[PDB]
Design a protein around this ligand. Sequence first.
Ligand code: HEB
Ligand SMILES: Nc1ncnc2c1ncn2[C@@H]1O[C@H](COP(=O)(O)OP(=O)(O)O)[C@@H](O)[C@H]1O
Ligand SMILES: [Mg+2]
Lengths: 561, 586
Amino acid sequence: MRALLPYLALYKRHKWMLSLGIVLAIVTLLASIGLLTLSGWFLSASAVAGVAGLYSFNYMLPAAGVRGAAITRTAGRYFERLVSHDATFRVLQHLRIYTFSKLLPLSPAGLARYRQGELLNRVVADVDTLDHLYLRVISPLVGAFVVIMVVTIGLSFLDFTLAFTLGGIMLLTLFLMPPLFYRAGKSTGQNLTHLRGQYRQQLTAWLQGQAELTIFGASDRYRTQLENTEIQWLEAQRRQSELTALSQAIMLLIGALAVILMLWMASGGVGGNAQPGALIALFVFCALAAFEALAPVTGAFQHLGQVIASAVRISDLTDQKPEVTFPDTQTRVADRVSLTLRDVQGISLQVNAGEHIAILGRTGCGKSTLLQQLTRAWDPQQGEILLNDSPIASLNEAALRQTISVVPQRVHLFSATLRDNLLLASPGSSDEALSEILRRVGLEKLLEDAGLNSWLGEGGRQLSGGELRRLAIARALLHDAPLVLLDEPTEGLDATTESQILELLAEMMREKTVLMVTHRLRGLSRFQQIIVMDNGQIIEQGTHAELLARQGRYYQFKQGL
Amino acid sequence: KSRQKELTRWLKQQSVISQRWLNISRLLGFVSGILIIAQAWFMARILQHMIMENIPREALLLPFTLLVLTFVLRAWVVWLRERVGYHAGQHIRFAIRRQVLDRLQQAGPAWIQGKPAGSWATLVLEQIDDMHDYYARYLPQMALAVSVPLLIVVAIFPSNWAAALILLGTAPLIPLFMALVGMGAADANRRNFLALARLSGHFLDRLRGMETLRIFGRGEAEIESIRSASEDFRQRTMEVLRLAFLSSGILEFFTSLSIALVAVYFGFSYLGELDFGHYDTGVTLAAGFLALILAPEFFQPLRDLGTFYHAKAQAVGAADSLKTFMETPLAHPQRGEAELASTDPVTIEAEELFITSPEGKTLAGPLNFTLPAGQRAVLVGRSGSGKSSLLNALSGFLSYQGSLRINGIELRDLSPESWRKHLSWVGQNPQLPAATLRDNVLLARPDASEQELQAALDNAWVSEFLPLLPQGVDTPVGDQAARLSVGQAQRVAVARALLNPCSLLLLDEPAASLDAHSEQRVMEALNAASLRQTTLMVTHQLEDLADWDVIWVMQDGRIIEQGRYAELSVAGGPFATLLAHRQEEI
Ligand code: HEB
Ligand SMILES: Nc1ncnc2c1ncn2[C@@H]1O[C@H](COP(=O)(O)OP(=O)(O)O)[C@@H](O)[C@H]1O
Ligand SMILES: [Mg+2]
């Protein structure tokens, strides 16, 4: 329950919309409780008064209470739904903004968790579940508690021993019963999570491995096993309904015990009266209508277990420690950046301004983390990385992100318009200045039919590997940075496209320092100071001709395979 | 012809599976309406005696006893009706999920490959279970919304026809205000649950791309995009919910008016200001409470139908995804009855072959190859040239409209159950679907002798890294074989393919995305096992193909060149271009 404090403190924003959505729930509940209590007394009082007692009965006061309790109940219900749904969308946005703001400064390192694609589908589903805490848990539980107190306090003016035995019954079933039913089905709700995640484990292994099951004749016996997990799973769901059925029968018996007690106890005297008369129905009808507030409480408390389970998962991620700290000093971005390194994983190299380097590693074995720690994904403990005669750790993020434009190995398509996938690099670029770059990088087929408004990514127009690589270079070309980091370009690309992209770099990154890492020997003659390394150690370096003439390791690379 | 009404029309057709369970639940909802009337009549007769006749409570032990039983019987029917409702929804989900898996196993790996396994699990697991509360709680309540209100009026009509007409007067007005705005808002709301699913898919989009937002400085700009997209969704939803929530407000107005009117009519009938509505007999107090205790119970079945709105709203959203899935037409491969006579290496032939995807799209163009018995061919080319489709067709996963003859027998004629017993495939990725590492190797024949299992483990070089595993040959692999790396997971798939002798061996780039040591061990094992039967391999390790006797350089779904490695590496054709592009790797 202490895990929810970071997310109940986000309620300070819109704390009036949230508190209005709970007041309106109480007012609507009290108007319905007071409409049947006033009506029950009116029939009793007017019947004992009779035709003789028509005079001096003063039925205009109840008429203004019948009229008042109906408007506050029909307008309260309409506005309780409006305000509480409006406030649910407002706290969902603030949960989304808070989660993104916390998860971003720890993006590379803090999110290298198992099943990265599945790690983020849980975060989206966990943020959705925190969104339920207000309407599904807080509004019913708080709304029911205040209604029980207002009824008990307001009903104790007539009699104390009758208000405390109806309010006491309602308070016992609000505080005792929701926990007794959450603990009675905590065992059934734990092997129901075990079986749900086991059926998904077996189903994914049955769908992903369908080629290797049909061929080897095991598809039918791995589905019979799958159907047995479902049958076990459908029984744990059955026991979770044998316990929801009981929690609804018992709620009907507690509301039946309050009615029986009010009929019995209040017939022996209300206040000091020997024969209460009309006051008997006031207590009986206040017990019939008062248990409409306690309907959600047993299921509201059950959902609180899932909201807490989500609040500890999100706090596991967002309450981490970022591995990179950015000083807050407003500096200038240089038009020419000379990159220098000194004993960092180590390896040391010099990248003078205006020259194109190429780091040539052995097919992923090196798995160059140089580009990660050069954009400050993690601080380098080995040595120092200097960026234009100033340590890289002393550069403000808004200035570091401007002096380094990296094209990644995994380029992301943001499921938006083709324009929004390129204002990502330079937001202020004009539409015409953005169409020139797209035509200049071989991406002409995109501008065919409403291209700059064409939805990319998830909605449609999925880009091909060669085309999706030309988009990363398009972003780096719009995002003018004096230092460009090419992370394994032209990998998995056909020989026609690879020659077209290496030519794309040489003529458009002409005045920008580049740092290209590859395991391919194509088009390295145009790079001065080629660097060849293995397992994080520089074997040799120099110009393409100088490496060939040296008859070194790079000569062996060009000789056969 | 709105989609909202088409999906609800689909949800009801699935309910005939549990028609017995929905009938029992509809019968118990009628008994609930009878015990509600019995409760109200006993409470009214007790309250009249203690208010009008001033009878002491000790003389009413007969109506109290019958009132307690009416409450105990009410709680028992609620407990029965809540368990019967589950069995209604369980047997519908069990049958729909069986239809989904049948529709998905028949389509085969060709169509399962279209969507990620995470998305298939959403359909089979999350969306099918989203229809439960429609069948378990909504449908049984929409039958209680007409069983009980109509049964209440039948009980108040004999006692007082004016109090029954007050409740019955509101009976047609509630659906009358559903024909004004109910249809308009309900389908508009269905398109707001879609926007809520898109907005949830736009936050996930920004979460999946925080690596790209980090290296461009767009962290603060995408917070404003989340703020604007969220604020956009709320405004358009609150424009519809400003009208959708009129249904709950109006229904809460008629239940207030009816309770008010029953109290005003009876209240002023006792005082003598009214003289109608009673069957020529003085209106009694017990008749007033009967028609007042039953006024909230007239509208309660309707007001609990709004409590279950999300049961319908999230089942219609699940019906949208499942109706289209079961309606998309697919072109399954044509299966037959013919059986291969012999276990000797098969001969492959093709004339104007046209491999086609299930959705009808042609993948590989005209193919005219021929592979004699016992020979080992190679498929080479660029990615997207249709060479991974050719091996799918030979396995029976893709339909075709050409000619693909196995030992002279057409592949459509061959029975898939018996054809694939002469077929071994190693494949691009391991995909170990069993529990342990021993149960993956023994997938082909689980009853293999302990000596024969060691033959496959040693040949595939699985036993060289077995001691590195915590439990050895019985080491579990978990989900996606994460216990062991892809280099040594592929060697498990090799041991599985070499377990039993086959007739045609398919190798779809077995040593791609493998480490240096594992690739060496895999090749040496698949270069020794490719000589034992008819082999056809897709590869890009073009420097090692000197031994293989036939090479098919395939581009754009067409075999554009043929010959051995000796006469292709110097021919200067499309293979020399491919070989040169490979020689630049290191
Ligand atoms: C379509 C759009 C929409 C949306 C989006 C939504 C979203 C939402 N929601 Fe909702 N609702 C609605 C529409 C809606 N909605 C409606 C219409 C209603 C009505 C109901 C009645 O009738 O009353 C409700 C109702 C409702 C309720 C109540 C129920 C009862 O009564 O019990 C609740 C609780 C809720 C929650 C919620 C949430 C949490 C959310 C987040 C996710 N909701
Ligand atoms: N099930 C499928 N449905 C639709 N298109 C497919 C399917 N399987 C493959 N393709 C497409 O067919 C083309 C050629 O076949 P593919 O197997 O991809 O060849 P390769 O293995 O050489 O890449 C590619 O565009 C591929 O994406
Ligand atoms: Mg392929």
